[model samples]
Target: MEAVLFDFNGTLIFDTPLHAFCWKEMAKRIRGTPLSEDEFKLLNGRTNKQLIEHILNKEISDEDAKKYAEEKENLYRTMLMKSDIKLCDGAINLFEALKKCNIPFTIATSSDWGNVQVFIQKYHLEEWFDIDKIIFNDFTFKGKPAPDIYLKASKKLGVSISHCIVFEDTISGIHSALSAGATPIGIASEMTVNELLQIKGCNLAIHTFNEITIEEMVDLIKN
Candidate 1:
């Protein structure tokens, strides 16, 4: 592949459980009910505004929605800090290998700037990525299941969409990559490997980056 695009929350980092918890917690306050796992999964890759609107069943004023999203993220950050914090298995090794090979990669996430800022600091992502090169939800671009983010990331990496390999963990994320004409490898952090493999457009699925060696990664697009 000419370039690689990774989704942050579940793909690069194993924070899907924390996010699911946070969404349920936030939903309890806003909708008087915690979102079921199935419900949350369906909304897995949506932007905060889209999630809030779905939970509340109407359009929220931008100012109020932003405030609510910030509060929800604060809760998420706090909860995550109280627990273990680390990148997903094999992420660092893969990143180092990619760097050694001079392969371009970028994070394309539906998370907002606030969450991204915290992640960069907490995870020391600055060592692996150029902060400015990360693409995030700002409400200006359509969130996952749409091709906007991946398309933009392809442009930023100066690569054709068809030549980019996207690593993603959600159904929407896989759809987004496929819609963008990029090859998608499902991370399977939230879903089973078989479930990811069942997605017709996904090229492959793995439980963790550790499952694939650098040679295997290179071979993925070579053949």
Candidate 2:
């Protein structure tokens, strides 16, 4: 089917800095110290529960995980609302063109509905996405770097994993797509282009949607 899948946090919305700030704030409240730079780097592409556990250095109950995640996400949402939050440049135009060309697309994110709903309203995501088909962390499967999310998303979209195009901005996300047998193009939203290109399976890396047109996407699928 040659469909497209987007990673939400960094790839689609450029929210890395925002997430880092919020997570550090939560760390300060819980541990009385902020996350070290190296620790902060580990949070990307992980589920909220996993990230929370990593922050606390202990496994957390599911209920407590949900509670803590919501608290952190609430803070994230508030900060997002205050900031100049918007979709990545060239995103809407690319989306519009993809639809016009009959190219199916959806998002696969580690974010839960408690958080994504805010983005839906904030961005009017329905204009470009089929909300029901957009996959998020449901706690039913392991998150990124496990391949379950992308595998589930491709199946849900009625596409073969080998025929799917994934845009990712994190190392774990790129790994997730690679493990799913999808074609992953690094977005370089937070990571450097060279960093992403260094990943063995990732040959293509771009800074923004403008870097690849619809024709380029088709070509990528072809050869």
Candidate 3:
């Protein structure tokens, strides 16, 4: 069976900016200098541990970083709860199509377990995925831009990476998918269209999933 791997943040959900907002707020309170937008972009798709380490300059203990990261994420979650959130256009339809077609798929995201669970519950996405199949932050041996997480997900799903398709929005995410030998279809929702188009290994850059179909996807992989 052909399996599709999705990047959670901007691909399935349209909350990339909210994540940026969360990071900005969290960084402002860090003991050291705050993180800029450029820094956050660089850290996107990485584990919170890695992100914190970079921000903290490796001075603080890992335990402290973990605690702080978790608290920051909790703050982010609260901000999300107070805002309006919905899946990207056609996200629900694509999910339904995956179900109707009996296609195998799962999310490979930078989000930690707590955030992932909250999203699953909030959006009622449990129906679309197997809880055990999810490859969240803590479960991965390595973070994005490193093919480890996608590789692990492929192994877990019993699918070949070469036969998998990944939908992503971030540069790190696209690189991760490609490093895993999967074809990537990028969504230019949060980033500029040029940015998405410029990324290597992005098989097709689309604005919305509604514009794509299984046949088109099949053709992309065939090329």
Best by TM-score: 2
Structure candidate 1, residue pairs in collision: none
Give the Cα error of residue 209 in candidate 2, in Å: 0.4
Q: List candidate 3 segments past 4 Å from native.
A: 30-58
Report lDDT per candidate. Answer: 0.86, 0.88, 0.80
TM-score of 2: 0.90
Give candidate 2 regions above 4 Å deviation: 36-39, 42-59
Query: Each candidate's TM vs. the true structure?
Result: 0.87, 0.90, 0.86
Candidate 3 lDDT over 1-223, as tens digits, reads: 3888888888887887887777777777774456787898788766667777776667567688789788878987887777788777887788888778877888887888889878887777788888888888895377778888889889888989988889888877888888989998998877766778787777588888888888788788888
C-alpha RMSD by candidate, in order: 2.4, 2.1, 2.6
Write the candidate numbers in order of decreasing TM-score: 2, 1, 3
- Candidates 1 and 3: which is better by TM-score? 1
Clashing pairs in 2: none
How many residue pairs clash (N, CA or C atoms closer than 3 angstroms) in each of the candidate models, in the order given? 0, 0, 0
Worst 10 residues of 1 by lDDT: 214-223
Specify the poorest-scoring 10-residue window by lDDT in model 2. 40-49
Over 4 Å off, model 1 = 30-59
